[PDB]
């Protein structure tokens, strides 16, 4: 009737892939895999993907394809008491578009600064460098003071981010114009690439979601030839089976697979909404998850061969140079490694292009999910001019991310990365899977999938939908809420007001679910049983 379809069946696959792959498969998976037993981490990763990731992925895809609605309009067909899921997802997507869209701005600054035969972060006689600028080893005669720092680390913490002008999260100091201009350019690109919808999206995804693979292959070929590259591959693949006895490895595997596949976020619902009715979403979800896992593996190889080259040029124990987890592994360590390799300009250019193209499609999908959701929710005031309400949300996200462009921006982006996403998204996805597999009835869902696909899913899928994945998400939630992390960044701890603000932000989205079921008191008054029986059952189709 009014919904649109993908231009090609490959466009949907490429869009879901580009949404699934991001920097979380480049700098987040290799570090977690090496820290948690090395090569022995692939077994719990595979187990948690088979039990937790693929079932939720396939359920979400089938649901979004059948009901043909976003993250807000679909709940009128399952449980109208959980309509606040869409608003909570909108809040979480606002927070994510605020914080995640700054890593791409840093990558863009590095890209526009790398246009020189001699990269800036390979020297030390600059205007941003202090006396602690000790160049890369290249020799073992020069000692290393505890205050000494590499030139690339100083270029990252004093030029591109300018963290030395802010004394910490207590005072951001001021906003920079360079990062502001880069993030404005990238937001303009996102808006001019996501305005029309899936028909225009699937045409840019052909370039944005396929370019990272060519660059990954080029970097793999370059790293496998560097001297001492076998050490990185060995340390990344040599298993440590003693680690598998601790629950931390399984918790980290569950978290990594849930944040790499990313179910329960309304993006998959929106993408499957624009899909055909009789489309075999089963094969689509399977191949998407397999491609995501294989991309994580290939990128781990790519990163660790270069870290092994570094540990051969510098001293050994890649674990020592890979001490920090975050964007520093890509902007400090890998930056040094690129600046130290022959033909550094081209490699830096393609690496930063890969980072930008890995973030771009992820932001595309994250914004298109909320756009489709609110459009299918409010078709009377919107969805008649889709060119609007996208500029509005882009401007809102830009004004919300302006606080990250300040000099103390790393602190704010880490605070938003460590509190706004994890527990809120986990609880949202858990309660969504509960509402779909328990309240909506697993029989009404299995017969539905049998009608659409032509065959009812196996008993394994019913087991993974009713008991396995809900207990999985509940386990992740209980593990995250039990150990509040004391996060630190660049030798700077976080005060208690920071933890309070992070707790308030993390609950600023999940709290949208109970307030909806409470404020519905005015809409449907009467006896409690009346509400319980009128809010669970969906409206007449």
């Amino acid at each position, epitope marked *: 009737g009014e919904r649109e379809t993908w231009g090609k069946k490959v466009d949907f696959l490429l869009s879901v892939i580009g949404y699934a792959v991001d920097l979380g498969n480049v700098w987040r998976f290799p570090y977690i895999c090496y820290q948690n037993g090395g090569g022995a981490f692939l077994l719990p990763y595979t187990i948690m993907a088979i039990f937790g990731g693929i079932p939720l992925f396939y359920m979400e895809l089938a649901l979004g394809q059948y009901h043909r609605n976003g993250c807000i309009s679909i709940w009128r067909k399952i449980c109208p008491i959980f309509k606040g899921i869409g608003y909570a997802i909108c809040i979480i997507a606002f927070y994510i578009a605020s914080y995640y869209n700054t890593i791409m701005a840093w990558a863009l600054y590095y890209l526009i600064s790398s246009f020189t035969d001699q990269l800036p972060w390979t020297s030390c006689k600059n205007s941003w460098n202090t006396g602690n600028c000790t160049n890369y080893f290249s020799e073992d005669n020069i000692t*290393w003071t505890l205050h000494s720092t590499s030139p690339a680390e100083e270029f990252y913490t004093r030029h591109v981010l300018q963290i030395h002008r802010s004394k910490g999260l207590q005072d951001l100091g001021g906003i920079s114009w360079q990062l502001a201009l880069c993030i404005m350019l990238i937001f303009t690109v996102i808006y001019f690439s996501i305005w029309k919808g899936v028909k225009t999206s699937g045409k840019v995804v052909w370039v944005t979601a396929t370019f990272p693979y060519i660059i990954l292959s080029v970097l793999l070929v370059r790293g496998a030839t560097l001297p001492g590259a076998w050490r990185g591959v060995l340390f990344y693949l040599k298993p440590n089976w003693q680690k598998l006895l601790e629950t931390g490895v399984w918790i980290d595997a569950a978290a990594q697979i849930f944040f790499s596949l990313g179910p329960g976020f309304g993006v998959l619902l929106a993408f499957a909404s624009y899909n055909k009715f009789n489309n075999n979403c089963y094969q689509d979800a399977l191949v998407t998850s397999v491609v995501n896992c294989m991309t994580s593996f290939v990128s781990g190889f790519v990163i660790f061969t270069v870290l092994g080259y570094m540990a051969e040029m510098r001293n050994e124990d890649v674990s020592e140079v890979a001490k920090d987890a975050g964007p520093s592994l890509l902007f400090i360590t890998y930056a040094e490694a690129i600046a130290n390799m022959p033909a550094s300009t081209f490699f830096a250019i393609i690496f930063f292009l890969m980072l930008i193209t890995l973030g771009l499609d992820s932001t595309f999908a994250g914004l298109e999910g909320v756009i489709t959701a609110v459009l299918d929710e409010f078709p009377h005031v919107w969805a008649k001019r889709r060119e609007r309400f996208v500029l509005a949300v882009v401007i809102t996200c830009f004004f919300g991310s302006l606080v990250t462009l300040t000099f103390g921006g790393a602190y704010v982006v880490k605070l938003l990365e460590e509190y706004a996403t994890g527990p809120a998204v986990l609880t949202v996805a858990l309660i969504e899977a509960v509402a779909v597999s328990w309240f909506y009835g697993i029989t009404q869902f299995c017969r539905d999938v049998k009608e659409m696909l032509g065959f009812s899913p196996g008993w394994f899928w019913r087991i993974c939908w009713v008991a396995i994945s809900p207990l999985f998400l509940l386990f992740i939630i209980c593990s995250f809420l039990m150990s509040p992390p004391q996060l630190r960044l660049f030798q700077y701890n976080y005060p208690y007001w920071s933890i309070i603000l992070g707790y308030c932000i993390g609950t600023s989205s999940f709290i949208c679910i109970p307030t909806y079921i409470a404020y519905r008191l005015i809409i449907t008054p009467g006896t409690f049983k009346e509400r319980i029986i009128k809010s669970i059952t969906p409206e007449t189709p």
Partner: antibody
Amino acid sequence: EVQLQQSGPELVKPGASVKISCKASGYTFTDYYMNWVKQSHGKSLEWIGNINPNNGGTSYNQKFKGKATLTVDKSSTTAYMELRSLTSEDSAVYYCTRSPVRPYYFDYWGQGTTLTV
Amino acid sequence: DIVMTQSHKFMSTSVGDRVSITCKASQDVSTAVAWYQQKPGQSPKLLIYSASYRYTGVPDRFTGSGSGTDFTFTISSVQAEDLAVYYCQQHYSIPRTFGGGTKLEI
């Protein structure tokens, strides 16, 4: 020209708890590590722990989980190592060592506290 | 852990010859191998770090060689003031581990 001073010999009751102080002087104390090594009687050396006088960081050996705690007081540039639950099996000479960050060569060594149980 | 062994604790040639003791490494350490000189009763002083660079303030006679797995301490024609034990420390990974050592008699 740059020597690290320590305490002298003492008698430790088996099962009690004691400490070993390392007063460093000669260079910028807040610029390098402060590592402890345990040399058993007529045997090989053994690295115990690591101290970062900039932020009180620690990095101790795996075989020294609950054997020695490491603290630092950069007021008079000293290094403390409390030995808890000491028996007659590890009581030996204790050296205080400084080492830069990751060439990790032990530059200067203490005088040698022959800690006898 | 990264265990580091040495040769026998007795075989050492007298003055005039070349006393060269070895250090077998468990894992592949590129060049991160140091050497120390602990005279009887004194504290160990640094002699050679990274297996090829001698520390500032040591005589030119003390030379280190070897890389990868076989590390050799080359102290030829020992004088009357080199009788000590020499340990073999690696800078690969925490925890760092020393070696057994060997005396140079006579």
